[PDB]
Amino acid sequence: APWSREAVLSLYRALLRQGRQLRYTDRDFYFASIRREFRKNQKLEDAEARERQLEKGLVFLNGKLGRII
Amino acid sequence: AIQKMTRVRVVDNSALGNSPYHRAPRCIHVYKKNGVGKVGDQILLAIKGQKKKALIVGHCMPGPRMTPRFDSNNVVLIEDNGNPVGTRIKTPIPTSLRKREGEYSKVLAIAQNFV
Amino acid sequence: RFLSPEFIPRRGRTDPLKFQIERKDMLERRKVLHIPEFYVGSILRVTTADPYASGKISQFLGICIQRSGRGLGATFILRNVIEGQGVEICFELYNPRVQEIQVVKLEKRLDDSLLYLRDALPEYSTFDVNMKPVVQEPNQKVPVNELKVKMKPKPWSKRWERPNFNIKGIRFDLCLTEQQMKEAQKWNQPWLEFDMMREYDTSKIEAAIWKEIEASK
Amino acid sequence: KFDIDMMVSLLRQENARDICVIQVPPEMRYTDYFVIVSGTSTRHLHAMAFYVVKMYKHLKCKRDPHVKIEGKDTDDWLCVDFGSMVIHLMLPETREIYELEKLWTLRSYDD
Amino acid sequence: LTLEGIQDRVLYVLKLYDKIDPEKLSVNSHFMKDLGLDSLDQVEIIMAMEDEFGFEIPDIDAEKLMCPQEIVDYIADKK
RNA sequence: CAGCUG
């Protein structure tokens, strides 16, 4: 359905790896937030919206346009 | 200069200012002791017969040098208490809203472009 | 020989000594930031410190529409559209909070005052912010761009069809009838073009100021 | 120094329901750091805001313009602007409907 | 640590997670339809496995395990 | 009432 579920896996992995040592924020809150982000809106849409969510996730990983320190 | 009854061009995600109609909202009142308005001045604005408080962010009148000079008189919708109504402002806002003391930070929490 | 037009003084009766002070001081500001040659059509990116912020730079890009003013306070105003809003910023050339002003695209538009981009379609005032600086041939005349723009509906912010403006970069006959011609050409004023005494003989002052600018070593 | 670390320590000992930070890259002109915090109720926001602002006032930063508690009149959404930091206290539902950190991350990528 | 050690740790983690109810707790407790799990939820589950034993599961085999016997085998042979 | 007008 999406560009690739493997890309979703990799970006989720990177986000959560940087979330394991997320010092300034809250781990439980970030877990709830990432769940609400990447689960509800990444399940049953057309491939266009799949790619939009994928781009949202890769940006949310990147941190250039606002990093979650 | 955004006086009384200038046709305002709201810029907010809130549908209050996006309900299409030939009545583009016109300012009712300005809380500066003079009736001229400038950047970040609380005004009373009329939208579809509903009065509301609004924030001037960008206008067509050439102000100080290192602030922008927009095309039409942009405003932001703010509820009576102070919570801004919208959550995404498509057009950009000047930085100059931050300078003086006052109720102006809570609308800085929406700008995608601090131009 | 090009002299930035904010070095040639307005005709008047202020005495030279002020102009000498202005010229020496603005030249001795040029040595901390080169102000590149730029014209009333060129495109520029400006980078300015934000005293509003905690010492972080703020960038902008747009087309310069007016080169206005003389002396240490002269300014240039550049227009650009973003998200449908046409924002113009007037930047003071010699301000202590302009780091670098670089010519993204040197080009000299047909007119001498591009104030009518407020009343042309946004396509002529659109520029992607992150565009890359086009190179230029060093030892040849600057480009003379001619994009005779297309106009919005009639009620313009001024009345540019008037001939005292002498605008040449607007399409009239494409969207104008001859009726506008024969009603707006009673205010044409032939005599003023040949008034033999309004003309500012700004040559001798040019030589003197070139000597002075040379001698800043 | 009244940096972010002492602030989050005060929040943790006061045990706000949530704390989080977002960084402002130097190519954005707004501020240096954006601390989204959320306490229990308006009284709790009032008390923690008063404690943090009083500690800031007394400890250091006397030679600069003072700090105003934005939106104390409004019982759901508060803000405070420091020289480099800015902190925002949120009601739960107000925080959800606004979702500021999303924009701070997706500045030009999502509505 | 030990084979029984990793087995009981895996069982304890599987019990710990809330969305899955440990009705069957063998090494053959299927994931997708029996316990109602999706691919992203599979990555969440294997992350939950990492946090106490593992921590270095790459992104190549995260959507085929299909049973906690494979979880145990992965933890056993990865060391 | 749409918008222009010292």
Curated annotation (Swiss-Prot), chain B:
UniProtKB keywords: Mitochondrion, Ribonucleoprotein, Ribosomal protein, Transit peptide
This protein's GO CC annotations: mitochondrial inner membrane; mitochondrial large ribosomal subunit; mitochondrion
Predominant cellular place of this UniProt entry's protein: mitochondrion
Transmembrane segments annotated in the record for this chain: none
GO biological process: mitochondrial translation
Subcellular location: Mitochondrion
Function: Forms part of 2 intersubunit bridges in the assembled ribosome. Upon binding to MALSU1 intersubunit bridge formation is blocked, preventing ribosome formation and repressing translation.
Description of how the protein assembles with itself and partners: Component of the mitochondrial large ribosomal subunit (mt-LSU). Mature mammalian 55S mitochondrial ribosomes consist of a small (28S) and a large (39S) subunit. The 28S small subunit contains a 12S ribosomal RNA (12S mt-rRNA) and 30 different proteins. The 39S large subunit contains a 16S rRNA (16S mt-rRNA), a copy of mitochondrial valine transfer RNA (mt-tRNA(Val)), which plays an integral structural role, and 52 different proteins. Interacts with MALSU1.
Protein name, UniProt field: Large ribosomal subunit protein uL14m
Source organism of this protein record: Homo sapiens
Name of encoding gene: MRPL14
Curated annotation (Swiss-Prot), chain C:
Subcellular location field: Mitochondrion
Top-level taxonomic group: Eukaryota
GO CC term (a single one): mitochondrial inner membrane
GO molecular function: structural constituent of ribosome
GO biological process per UniProt: mitochondrial translation
Keywords: Mitochondrion, Phosphoprotein, Ribonucleoprotein, Ribosomal protein, Transit peptide
Protein family according to the UniProt entry: Belongs to the bacterial ribosomal protein bL19 family.
Assembly: Component of the mitochondrial large ribosomal subunit (mt-LSU). Mature mammalian 55S mitochondrial ribosomes consist of a small (28S) and a large (39S) subunit. The 28S small subunit contains a 12S ribosomal RNA (12S mt-rRNA) and 30 different proteins. The 39S large subunit contains a 16S rRNA (16S mt-rRNA), a copy of mitochondrial valine transfer RNA (mt-tRNA(Val)), which plays an integral structural role, and 52 different proteins.
Protein name: Large ribosomal subunit protein bL19m
Species assigned in the record: Homo sapiens (Human)
Full-sequence range covered: 74 to 290 of 292
Swiss-Prot record, chain D:
Transmembrane segments annotated in the record for this chain: none
Superkingdom, natural source: Eukaryota
UniProt-annotated location(s): Mitochondrion matrix
Disulfides per UniProt: none
Its job: Required for normal mitochondrial ribosome function and mitochondrial translation. May play a role in ribosome biogenesis by preventing premature association of the 28S and 39S ribosomal subunits. Interacts with mitochondrial ribosomal protein uL14m (MRPL14), probably blocking formation of intersubunit bridge B8, preventing association of the 28S and 39S ribosomal subunits. Addition to isolated mitochondrial ribosomal subunits partially inhibits translation, probably by interfering with the association of the 28S and 39S ribosomal subunits and the formation of functional ribosomes.
Subunit structure of this chain's protein: Associates with the mitochondrial ribosome large subunit (39S) via interaction with MRPL12 and/or MRPL14. The interaction generates steric hindrance that is expected to prevent premature association of the 28S and 39S ribosomal subunits. Interacts with intermediates of the mitochondrial ribosome large subunit (mt-LSU) (recruits the mitochondrial ribosome and complex I assembly factor AltMIEF1 and NDUFAB1); regulates mitochondrial ribosomes assembly. Interacts with MRPL12 and MRPL14.
Family: Belongs to the Iojap/RsfS family.
Name assigned to this protein: Mitochondrial assembly of ribosomal large subunit protein 1
Species for this entry: Homo sapiens
Range covered out of full length: 91 to 201 of 234
UniProtKB/Swiss-Prot annotation, chain E:
One Gene Ontology term of the molecular function aspect: mitochondrial large ribosomal subunit binding
Note: In contrast to other accessory subunits of complex I, NDUFAB1 is the only subunit that is essential for cell viability in HEK293T cells. Since knockout cells lack assembled complex I and die in galactose media, this suggests that the essential role of NDUFAB1 is independent of complex I.
Protein name: Acyl carrier protein, mitochondrial
NADP as UniProt keyword: no
Sequence similarity: Belongs to the acyl carrier protein (ACP) family.
Record's keyword terms, sorted: Acetylation, Electron transport, Fatty acid biosynthesis, Fatty acid metabolism, Lipid biosynthesis, Lipid metabolism, Mitochondrion, Phosphopantetheine, Phosphoprotein, Respiratory chain, Transit peptide, Transport
GO BP, sorted A to Z: [2Fe-2S] cluster assembly; aerobic respiration; fatty acid biosynthetic process; iron-sulfur cluster assembly; mitochondrial electron transport, NADH to ubiquinone; protein lipoylation; proton motive force-driven mitochondrial ATP synthesis
Covered range of the whole protein: 74 to 152 of 156
Residues the record lists as N6-acetyllysine modifications: 15
Modified residues (O-(pantetheine 4'-phosphoryl)serine): 39
Tree of life domain: Eukaryota
A GO cellular-component term linked to this record: nucleoplasm
Keyword check for Ribosomal protein: no
Residue ranges constituting the Carrier domain according to the UniProt record: 4-79
UniProt-annotated location(s): Mitochondrion
